[PDB]
């Protein structure tokens, strides 16, 4: 016997409201609902009383009881050498009774031993949304090309013109949500079983994948609803592709397939194709490309959960995340500030990491708003995601993790989500076209290489799955 959705199950088979989990009342009668409850340490410099209640440091040691047990007022609580020459202290000094103390002001708080130096503010990813310049004792934010600093708010917004949309799959249809207006429209009606999609903004194409017909399709958005104007790109050799990614610079589609257990690549027309990875993949899900630096990133929730990283030609594969990771199944990139965002369906988290793999940050950790999340998207100051238990798309401030709004709801199967906007897909040179020979010399595929040094190779050729690259590095040899 299990409990209903919003109940907690006691060890003695009894169901209580889950909001009575960890509130210091034994409601199960066998103390079950009050076991392994997380303890409490407060904000920046707040005093923890003997029972875990949070009071400001200044109320402590003043004769008045603040904490509900009154333990800041027992003797295990407490303890002008200061104005004259400043008494060894550099900036702000206040005289304490048992010894003097020395702290700093706003903008420079870092001290070795009570002498203060500047805060380097740009050693934090989410200090500014975009560009961060560090000065002595303060800092300043600027905007990446295409973005204007809104003077009323804090934020770098997109230059005025065409406004952001969200495009997402409801499993049997695709829906578009305007963002400036609220203009909520059905972009494709009547699909069998579709969880994966991506868009090419500049040519106005939508790419999506059906798991039941086992095909990958493509259409123009103005004509996507007309079944005749939906083109089949791939109709063979697919099992269950759950992730898609379009490389807009170099005209390739990348997909995962958790059935065949592979990661693949194909030309946008679907005419030339290679499998890039077969081995050490269990349940690969989401895939995203960084075509400006030649990389691709993906997730898998097999027994060993990873976010992995490789070149767009599928060399130089490395694991990027393998700790505190259970069920990661949504992934998105901020290309300009070189930052990766993921959601974890089991651990109920929304986290971020550097493209390099460090400066890892747990942005949101709410079991209420991240019950079973799936798709994830990023634009300007906000992060978006879809939830399967809450039947909805949420938004939030992606710098702090706060301001969690609820963008649309009453959605039965909301899976994958993309931001449709010109600025998500910057223009970049395609090296397979600025080349001595057409198509970089290649007979089949020209795949962008990962830029590791400033002079790496810019591309490399690739052959069908049933053929090998010859010694010229450019021709395909038969079997």
Partner 1 sequence: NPVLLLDTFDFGPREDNWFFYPGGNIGLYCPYSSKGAPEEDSAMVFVSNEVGEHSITTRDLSVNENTIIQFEINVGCSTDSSSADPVRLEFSRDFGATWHLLLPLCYHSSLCSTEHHPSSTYYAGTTQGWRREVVHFGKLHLAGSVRFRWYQGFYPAGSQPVTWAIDNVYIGPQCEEMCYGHGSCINGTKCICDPGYSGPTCKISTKNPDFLKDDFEGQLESDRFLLMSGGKPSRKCGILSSGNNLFFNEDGLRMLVTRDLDLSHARFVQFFMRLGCGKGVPDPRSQPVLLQYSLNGGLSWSLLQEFLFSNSSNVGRYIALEMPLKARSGSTRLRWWQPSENGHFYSPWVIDQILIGGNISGNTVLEDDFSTLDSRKWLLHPGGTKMPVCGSTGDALVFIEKASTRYVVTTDIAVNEDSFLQIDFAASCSVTDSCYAIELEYSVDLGLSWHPLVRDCLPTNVECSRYHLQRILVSDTFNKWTRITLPLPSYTRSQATRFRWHQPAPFDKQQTWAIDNVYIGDGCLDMCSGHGRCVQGSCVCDEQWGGLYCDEPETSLPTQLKDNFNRAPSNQNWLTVSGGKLSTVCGAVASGLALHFSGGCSRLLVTVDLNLTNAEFIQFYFMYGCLITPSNRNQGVLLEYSVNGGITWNLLMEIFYDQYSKPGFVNILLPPDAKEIATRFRWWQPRHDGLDQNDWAIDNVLISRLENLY
Ligand X SMILES: *[C@@H]1O[C@H](CO)[C@@H](O)[C@H](O)[C@H]1NC(C)=O
Interface ranges with partner 1 (CB under 8 A): 6, 17, 19-20, 23, 25, 27, 55, 59, 64, 66, 83-84, 105-107, 127-128, 132, 135, 137-141, 151-152, 154, 402
The residues pairing with 296 across neighbouring beta strands, listed in sequence order, are 289, 310
Q: Nearer to partner 1 by C-beta: 102 or 132?
A: 132
Minimum Å gap between C-beta 20 and partner 1 is: 7
Is 159 in contact with 150 (CB distance < 8 Å)?
Answer: no
**Residue reference for tokens 């679907």:** 270
The pair of structure tokens assigned to 387 is 């939830």
Q: Nearest distance from residue 188's CB to partner 1, in Å?
A: 27
The set of long-range contacts for 296-302, using a CB threshold of 8 Å and a minimum separation of 24, is 296/245, 296/254, 297/331, 297/333, 297/340, 298/243, 298/256, 298/263, 298/331, 299/328, 299/329, 299/330, 299/331, 299/342, 300/258, 300/328, 301/326, 301/327, 301/328, 301/329, 301/345
Looking at residues 251 to 280 of the shown chain, list those that interact with ligand X (rule: CB under 6 A). Answer: 259-260
Sequence length of the chain is 479
For residues 253 and 208, is the Cβ–Cβ distance under 8 A?
no
Looking at residue 474, the DSSP 8-state letter turns out to be: S
Q: How many residues bind ligand X (CB under 6 A)?
A: 4
Task: Considering only the stretches 53-61, 361-369, 413-421, 467-475, report the one whose residues sit in contact with Ca ion under the rule CB under 5 A.
Answer: 53-61
Binding of Ca ion by 64 (CB under 5 A): yes
409 touches 449 (CB < 8 A): no
Per-residue binder mask for ligand X (CB under 6 A), 181-220, x = binder: ----------------------------------------
Among partner 1, ligand X, Ca ion, none, the one that 140 touches (CB under a kind-dependent 5 to 8 A) is partner 1
Nearest residue (CB) to ligand X, 119 versus 281: 281
Q: Which residues are 176's β-sheet partners?
A: 167, 185
**Residues sharing a CB contact under 8 Å with residue 471, sequence separation 6 or more, in sequence order:** none
Minimum distance from CB of 235 to ligand X (Å)?
12
Furthest C-alpha separation in the chain:
89
Residue 55: contacted member of ligand X, Ca ion, partner 1, none (CB under 5 to 8 Å, by partner type): partner 1
Among 7, 27, 146, 221, binds Ca ion (CB under 5 A): 27
Residue 239 sits in the site that holds ligand X (CB under 6 A): yes
To ligand X, the closest distance from the beta carbon of 260 in angstroms equals 4
Q: Is 100 in the site for Ca ion (CB under 5 A)?
A: yes
The binder of 239, among partner 1, ligand X, Ca ion, none, by C-beta within 5 to 8 A per type, is ligand X
Q: Binds 260, which of partner 1, Ca ion, ligand X, none (CB < 5 to 8 A, cut-off by type)?
A: ligand X
Q: Is 250 left (phi over 0), alpha (psi -120 to 50) or beta?
A: alpha
Burial class (CB in 10 A: 0-12, 13-18, 19+), 361: middle
Nearer to ligand X, 281 or 305 (CB): 281
Residue 2 or 303 with smaller CB distance to partner 1 = 2
CB of 465 to ligand X, least distance (A): 8
**Is residue 282 a contact residue for ligand X (CB under 6 A)?**
no
Q: For the CB of residue 146, give the shortest distance to partner 1 in the complex, in Å.
A: 19
Kindly identify the residues of this chain, within the stretch 77-96, that bind ligand X according to CB under 6 A: none
Geometric angle at alpha carbon 84, from 83 and 87, rounded to 5°:
85
Breaks (C-N over 2.5 A) in the chain follow: 79
Q: Which of residues 29-58 bind ligand X (CB under 6 A)?
A: none
Q: How far is the CB of 67 from Ca ion (least distance, A)?
A: 8
Q: Which two tokens stand for residue 348?
A: 């109920």
| The one among 183, 237, 324, 356 contacting ligand X by CB under 6 A | 237
What residue 100 binds from ligand X, Ca ion, partner 1, none (CB within 5 to 8 A, per partner kind)?
Answer: Ca ion
Residue 345, SS3? Answer: coil
- Phi and psi at residue 19, to the nearest 5°: -85, 0
Q: Compare residues 40 and 239 and give the one whose CB is closer to ligand X.
A: 239
Contacts of 451 (CB under 8 A, 6+ apart): 293, 294, 458
Binding site for ligand X (CB under 6 A): 237, 239, 259-260
Binding site for Ca ion (CB under 5 A): 20, 23, 25, 27, 33, 59, 62, 64, 66, 72, 81, 95, 100, 118-119, 134, 139
């Amino acid at each position: 016997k299990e409990c209903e959705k919003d109940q907690f199950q006691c060890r003695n088979e009894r169901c209580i409201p889950s909001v009575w989990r960890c509130d210091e009342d034994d409601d199960c009668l066998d103390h079950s609902d009050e076991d392994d409850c997380p303890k409490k340490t407060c904000a920046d410099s707040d005093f923890t009383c003997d029972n875990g209640h949070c009071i400001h440091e200044r109320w402590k040691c003043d004769g008045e009881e603040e904490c509900p047990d009154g333990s800041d007022e027992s003797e295990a609580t407490c303890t002008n050498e200061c104005l004259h020459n400043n008494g060894g202290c550099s900036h702000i000094c206040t005289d304490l009774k048992i010894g003097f103390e020395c702290t700093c002001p706003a903008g420079f708080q870092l001290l070795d031993q009570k002498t203060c130096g500047d805060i380097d503010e740009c050693k934090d990813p989410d200090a500014c949304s975009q560009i961060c310049v560090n000065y002595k004792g303060y800092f300043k934010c600027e905007c990446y090309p295409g973005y204007e600093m809104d003077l009323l708010t804090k934020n770098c917004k997109a230059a005025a013109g065409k406004s952001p949309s969200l495009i997402f799959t409801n499993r049997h249809e695709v829906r578009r949500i305007d963002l400036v207006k609220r203009n909520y429209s059905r972009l494709i009606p009547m699909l069998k079983n579709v969880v994966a999609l991506d868009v090419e903004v500049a040519t106005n194409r939508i790419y999506w994948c059906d798991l039941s017909y086992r095909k990958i399709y493509s259409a123009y958005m103005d004509k996507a609803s007309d079944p005749k104007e939906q083109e089949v790109l791939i109709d063979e050799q697919l099992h269950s592709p759950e992730g898609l990614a379009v490389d807009w610079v170099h005209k390739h589609i990348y997909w995962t397939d958790s059935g065949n257990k592979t990661i693949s690549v194909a030309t946008v027309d679907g005419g030339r194709r290679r499998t890039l990875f077969s081995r050490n993949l269990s349940e690969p899900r989401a895939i995203a490309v960084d075509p400006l630096r030649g990389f691709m990133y993906w997730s898998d929730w097999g027994d060993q959960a990873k976010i992995e990283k490789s070149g767009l030609n599928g060399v130089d594969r490395q694991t990027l995340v393998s700790d505190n990771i259970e069920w990661p199944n949504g992934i998105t990139l901020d290309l300009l500030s070189q930052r990766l965002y993921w959601v974890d369906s089991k651990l109920h988290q929304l986290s971020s990491i550097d493209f390099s793999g460090g400066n890892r940050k747990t942005l949101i950790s709410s079991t209420d708003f991240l019950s079973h999340p799936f798709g994830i998207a990023v634009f300007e100051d906000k992060v978006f995601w879809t939830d399967l238990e809450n039947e909805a798309i949420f938004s939030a401030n992606r710098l702090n993790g706060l301001e969690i709004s609820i963008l649309a709801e009453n959605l039965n199967n909301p899976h994958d989500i993309v931001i449709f906007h010109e600025l998500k897909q910057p223009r970049a040179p395609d090296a397979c076209e600025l080349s001595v020979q057409p198509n970089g010399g290649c007979e089949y595929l020209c795949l962008p290489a990962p830029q590791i040094s400033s002079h790496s190779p810019k591309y490399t050729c690739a052959c069908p799955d049933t053929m090998w690259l010859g010694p010229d590095m450019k021709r395909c040899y038969r079997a």
